[PDB]
Design a protein around this nucleic acid. Structure first.
Lengths: 150, 118, 104, 173, 130, 162, 196, 51
RNA sequence: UCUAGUGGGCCAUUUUUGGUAAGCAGAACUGGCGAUGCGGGAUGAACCGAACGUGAGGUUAAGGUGCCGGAAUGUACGCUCA
RNA sequence: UCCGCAUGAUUUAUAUGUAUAAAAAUAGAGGUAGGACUUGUUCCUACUCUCCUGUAUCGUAGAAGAUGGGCGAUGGUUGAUGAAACGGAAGUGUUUUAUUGACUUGUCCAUGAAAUUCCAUUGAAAUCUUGUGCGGAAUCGAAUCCAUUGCAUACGACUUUAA
């Protein structure tokens, strides 16, 4: 039960499954897209701990259109060596501090397949975060959500 | 041929074969417009699916890790001279007792196990 | 000779309202009233002891063994997994929780 | 669980208005995101500012200066019932103004079936004088010689020993 | 017989401070009151009446007293030994000691109780026979 | 074909601090279940335990560290007992690969009378002579060891101390 | 904590539904339960509500054959048993076995008057019903509904109480003598160090 | 190659195979070896306790 | 490029038209059933959650934790006697 | 067909101490020889014992529990006979009394438990009927069919009679 516009936006954001997470750079275009898909996603500001934990545990890269675990720096160097990204550490740096090749760095990472949160969601999940649900902008509370979901 | 695990041991009996004698137990895919078995309602019998397929490494293997190769004569038994540790001879039912004795002796000489000896 | 086990009762299998999972059993242990107290009994061996009619090896007593895995609920009930699933005709029967894998 | 935040915001400076006025208010919200949402919700009533056309310049959580002393808090609220909009004043004795607000929300929900969304906290003040304390039941707690028995409860369970299914004797009080 | 007033001594039965003495110095409302204890580990706080049990000890203390004067009045009065030399506290202490013993202590208790049982059985037999 | 060589190196077992030598422990399983014994030394994953034969009747044997409950009873001095004598090969059954049968007329020879040769009891007598003053000095220890362990009605192992 | 073979519950001062819920749970757990003095059970609400509810229950009978219709038992023990049966899955073999282990009776018969009787604090009226709110008695409800043995049960209870009081006095004498002997024992001084 | 994924947050060897700086990484370093003053301000305090 | 089946639809939200109204008839958007099993609403094509290969372990959604029934006869503040 | 000279099957055994019999209310006598005389809606007696419910009390050492002793009691526990009494709500149970047994761990002593040499097992003993060796004889039967009656009746069934 997804409307065509929200479904198209989530496809373009690569959020095609429940409990899937992606990194985006916040501009006017992405802000308006997230506004349209507000009832179906949560988003917020991740910190360094969340970014590094995501890329270390759930870090999967897209090489030859295949989901390959980031178990070695050679894979990252092969995929993003032209952008001076040779390791998981500078991949984390590019994701955290939005640099020049953020588009390539974020697209190389396969969307994170998070588990169901430990402890569950709130009492009602499909209300806005302001109303007491788990939808829309939650600011730094995305860090707690990712911690439970990782 | 090590740690042979069967996903399912039941034979997938046909629907209503237990109720009607004219309906055999051989599986038939239900194609009714109101077939609860086809729709897979809870509590109904399961239908055969590709997911039930056993491991390719352990497929066709008997619990002893061998494959029952059917043999009708001594020449058939000689086919397993090199494949002694993977195939076991199974004597055909139409073979006479006189020829079955020779088949058993040849299998014993070649070391090939017999599934239905004696 | 006396007992070296805690009394327990076999309540039911792990289940939803209408779906049962006989692979795990719910066990109520005497004196265990909270999931915090259930942590002590986690991993302990639990046995179901019953009688038969055919002597086997000279003894008419048969025992099915299992291990407590995780607490269930908030009232000290635990989940147990047995080598052979406990028959549901034993719902409400007595089980013995041993101290065999002790850490105290 | 509620917390009190002071929120200071303003309108985005424009060509005609290079120095917009700064507006501050105290809001009782579970978190900072709800506090800023409440700030914009209340600001949209009087001013012509929105979240898109405005910005929050400060948000600070306020703790009780004297959490370890008993005070009387008078709360003026405006709420919407099933018929119309009403203004009420209530008194609560508490050691924290946030706790008094939470007690006010619980009391309104229990009595008038008023939800959080339908209640606006107009003002919360501390009354240190019985000459301005007007509720008789609150004032009766200020007398120097106050004594009463324990409220009728279900006796003491006392640890896990009260979890026994059966009891050997009848309870005593 | 016991009421809730300023100066009433209570015993905490719920929370981390279970089994600790406190004195009510201010009554917040009919459901909560502010309590304090001279002990350093017990901080002045606000507690509900369901988490405490009233005692028989009532001390003379002004309403809204501070921690320092609460301790001073606690030391000046004999509230410490008043609670200590009571059936309630003695019975609690016996319970605490009974829960703070190991298997060797249990064996020693069993032997001592066996000796007491034999002596008591002889005593009652002799007294009844007369 | 040859299997791959696994990377599972054997490392020494680290036991609980409560299972120190000289500690009184309660046997939970086996023939001597419920008995109270004294820990002599520590093997790889087991404990060499023996209740003194003049009080308990449990010989020098092994017990799994998981199958004992350590007791906070006062420690028994086991300083000089020659622990190095007891090894894995000491409590090791004879080489029984090949000609072994378990028919009748074999339990009359496996009895301790016509079995269990010297250097077992002879050393046990000397070790008990060395260890006797500790038990004699500690009151109630001899009777405590001689008494077995049991769970009475209302006993909760998760809350009681040992 | 209570895994004993058979438990005898004195139903006086208990609430019918809460006691039935506890009893049914114990029966499913595998515990034999004997409920005595079912005529002293209490039901919240004033007597007219409970009388009207029972009358509405009694009005429900099979239209074409009342002999096969619903059977309305008037005894207080049978009212308690009906509540337990409704709380139990009696239409299965497991539920029937659980119900077979319940023995609810009026008064305390000779099989159980010399046995220990316990109470369920979670079902006690004094602990569950707010004071000042009126409640009815199942014995009175049964007597006004058609139970015939209210007076004889009361007379037998008077005799049992007289016998029980005599037994208590005889037990009290022994208890006082044991306590007096134990008070003078010198072992108590060295035993108090262990909390005994 | 890569028959089984090891979590670097759990496996120290994998945490060393990646991120060579992890061994030299330091944390929980004290930076309050000074008078450590307070920056509150009378204006800020009055605004905070305005009403 | 070739060809099959289809050319009776129905339900729900929202915007409506004709009718006193309808489980009525006729239009627009979206999601569904038809062809959708599973958990929940005691029961159910559409409602909520969620779309399904064979299994193990963990965590959840909607919905619940007196008993039937798996899970607190949980905590805090009040209201109500029918 | 009852007692024993005993074998076997079963359970108490849905067992592992699965031991515990006052009444009623809770702003009260909660009662605990409760005391206090003067058998009463009495005290200033006892007064902080009531309130932490049972986290209580009783029992609990011994080859699944053995062999021989010194001290301390002058008792306790478990059975069979004996004199009995009291229990009818389903009393099938509760006390008391003499003989006959065995232990007594209240305390100190000695010998002996092993190899069942790291767990997968639940023990001795008591009661009950059915099979076999019975000495002692057997204090002792009914129902139905076939008949009969009509106080009954389609047939069964029912009410009578019979030797």
């Amino acid at each position: 039960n997804i409307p065509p516009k929200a479904r198209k936006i989530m496809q373009l954001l690569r959020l095609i499954q429940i409990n899937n997470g992606v990194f985006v750079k916040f501009n006017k275009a992405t802000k308006e897209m997230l506004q349209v898909v507000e009832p179906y996603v949560t988003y917020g500001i991740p910190n360094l701990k969340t970014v590094r934990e995501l890329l270390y545990k759930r870090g999967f890269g897209k090489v030859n259109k295949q989901r390959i675990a980031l178990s070695d720096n050679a894979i990252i160097e092969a995929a993003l060596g032209k952008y001076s990204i040779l390791s998981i550490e500078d991949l984390i740096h590019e994701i955290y501090t939005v640099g020049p090749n953020f588009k390539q760095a974020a697209n190389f990472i396969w969307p994170f397949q998070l588990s169901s949160p430990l402890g569950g969601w709130r009492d009602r999940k499909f209300k806005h975060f302001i109303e007491g649900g788990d939808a829309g902008k939650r600011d730094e509370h995305i860090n707690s959500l990712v911690r439970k979901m990782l | 041929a090590v740690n042979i695990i069967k996903k399912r041991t039941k034979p997938f009996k046909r629907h209503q074969s237990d109720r009607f004698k004219r309906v055999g137990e051989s599986w038939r895919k239900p194609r009714g417009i109101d077939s609860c078995v086809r729709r897979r309602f809870r509590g109904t019998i399961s239908m055969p699916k590709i997911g039930y397929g056993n491991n390719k490494k352990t497929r066709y293997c008997m619990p002893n890790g061998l494959k029952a190769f059917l043999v009708r004569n001594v020449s058939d038994v000689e086919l397993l001279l090199m494949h002694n540790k993977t195939y076991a001879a199974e004597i055909a039912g139409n073979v006479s007792a006189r020829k079955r004795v020779e088949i058993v002796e040849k299998a014993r000489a070649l070391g090939v196990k017999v599934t239905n000896a004696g | 000779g006396h007992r070296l086990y805690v009394k327990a009762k076999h309540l039911s299998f792990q289940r939803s309202k209408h779906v049962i999972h006989p692979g795990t059993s719910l066990v109520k242990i005497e004196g265990c009233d909270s999931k915090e107290e259930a942590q002590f009994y986690l991993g302990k061996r639990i046995c179901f002891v019953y009688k038969s009619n055919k002597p086997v090896r000279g003894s008419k007593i048969r025992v099915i063994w299992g291990t407590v895995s995780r607490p269930h609920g908030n009232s000290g009930v635990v989940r147990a997994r047995f080598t052979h699933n406990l028959p549901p005709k034993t719902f409400g029967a007595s089980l013995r929780v041993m101290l065999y894998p002790s850490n105290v | 669980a509620l917390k009190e935040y002071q929120v200071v915001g303003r309108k985005v400076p424009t060509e005609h208005e290079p120095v917009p006025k700064l507006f501050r208010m105290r809001l009782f919200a579970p978190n900072e995101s709800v506090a800023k949402s409440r700030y914009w919700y209340f600001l949209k009533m009087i001013n012509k500012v929105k979240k898109a056309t405005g910005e929050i310049v400060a948000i600070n959580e306020i703790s009780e200066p004297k959490p370890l002393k008993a005070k009387v808090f008078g709360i003026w609220i405006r709420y919407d019932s099933r018929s119309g909009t009403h203004n009420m004043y209530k008194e609560f004795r508490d050691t924290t103004r946030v706790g008094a607000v939470e007690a006010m929300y619980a009391d309104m929900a229990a009595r008038h079936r008023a939800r959080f969304r339908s209640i606006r906290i107009l003002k919360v003040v501390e009354v240190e004088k019985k000459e301005d304390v007007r509720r008789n039941y609150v004032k009766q707690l200020l007398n120097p010689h106050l004594k009463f028995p324990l409220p009728h409860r279900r006796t003491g369970v006392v640890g896990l020993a009260g979890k026994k299914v059966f009891a050997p004797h009848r309870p005593s009080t | 017989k016991r009421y809730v007033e300023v100066g009433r001594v209570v015993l905490v039965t719920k929370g981390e401070y279970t089994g600790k003495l406190a004195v009510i110095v201010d009554i917040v409302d009919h459901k909560r009151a502010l309590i304090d204890s001279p002990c350093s580990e017990f901080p002045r706080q606000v507690i509900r009446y369901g988490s405490v049990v009233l005692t028989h000890i009532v001390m003379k203390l002004p309403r809204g007293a501070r921690s320092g004067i609460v301790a001073k009045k606690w030391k000046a009065q004999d509230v410490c030994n008043k609670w200590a030399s009571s059936a309630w506290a003695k019975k609690l202490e016996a319970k605490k000691v009974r829960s703070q013993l190991n298997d060797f202590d249990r064996f020693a208790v069993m032997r001592l109780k066996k000796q007491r049982r034999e002596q008591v059985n002889v005593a009652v037999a002799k007294a009844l026979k007369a | 074909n040859v299997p791959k060589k696994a990377r599972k190196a054997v490392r020494p077992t680290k036991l609980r601090a409560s299972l120190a030598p000289g500690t009184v422990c309660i046997l939970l399983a086996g023939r001597f279940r419920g008995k109270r014994v004294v820990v002599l030394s520590q093997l790889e994953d087991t404990l060499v335990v023996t209740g003194p034969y003049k009080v308990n009747g449990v010989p020098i044997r092994r017990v799994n560290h998981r199958y004992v409950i350590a007791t906070s009873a006062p420690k028994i001095d086991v300083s000089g007992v020659s622990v190095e004598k007891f090894t894995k090969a000491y409590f090791a059954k004879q080489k029984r690969s090949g000609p072994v049968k378990k028919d009748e007329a074999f339990f009359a020879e496996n009895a301790p009378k016509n079995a269990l040769p010297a250097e077992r009891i002879a050393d046990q007598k000397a070790v008990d002579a060395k260890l006797l003053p500790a038990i004699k000095a500690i009151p109630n220890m001899k009777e405590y060891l001689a008494a077995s362990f049991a769970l009475s009605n209302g006993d909760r192992p998760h809350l009681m101390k040992f | 904590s209570e895994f004993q073979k058979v438990v005898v519950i004195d139903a006086k001062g208990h609430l019918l539904g809460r006691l039935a819920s506890v009893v049914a749970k114990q029966l499913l757990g595998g515990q034999k339960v004997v409920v005595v003095r079912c005529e002293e059970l209490n039901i919240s609400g004033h007597f007219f509500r409970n009388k009207l509810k029972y009358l509405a229950y009694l009005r429900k009978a099979c239209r074409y054959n009342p002999s096969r219709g619903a059977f309305h038992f008037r005894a207080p023990s049978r009212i308690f048993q009906k509540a337990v049966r409704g709380m139990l899955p009696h239409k299965t073999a497991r539920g029937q076995a659980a119900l077979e282990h319940l023995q609810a009776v009026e008064g305390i018969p000779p099989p159980f008057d010399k046995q220990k009787r316990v109470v369920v604090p979670a079902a006690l009226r004094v602990l569950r019903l707010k004071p000042g709110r009126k409640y009815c008695t199942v014995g009175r409800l049964s007597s006004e509904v058609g139970w015939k043995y209210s007076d004889i049960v009361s007379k037998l209870e008077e005799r049992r109480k007289v016998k029980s009081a005599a037994f208590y006095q005889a037990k009290l004498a022994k208890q006082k003598k044991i306590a007096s002997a134990k008070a003078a024992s010198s072992v108590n001084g060295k035993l108090a160090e262990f909390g005994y | 190659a890569h028959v089984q994924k090891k979590n670097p947050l759990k496996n120290k060897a994998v945490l060393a195979r990646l991120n060579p700086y992890a061994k030299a990484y330091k944390a929980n370093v004290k930076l309050n070896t000074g008078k450590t003053p307070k920056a509150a301000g009378e204006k800020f305090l009055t605004v905070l306790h305005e009403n």
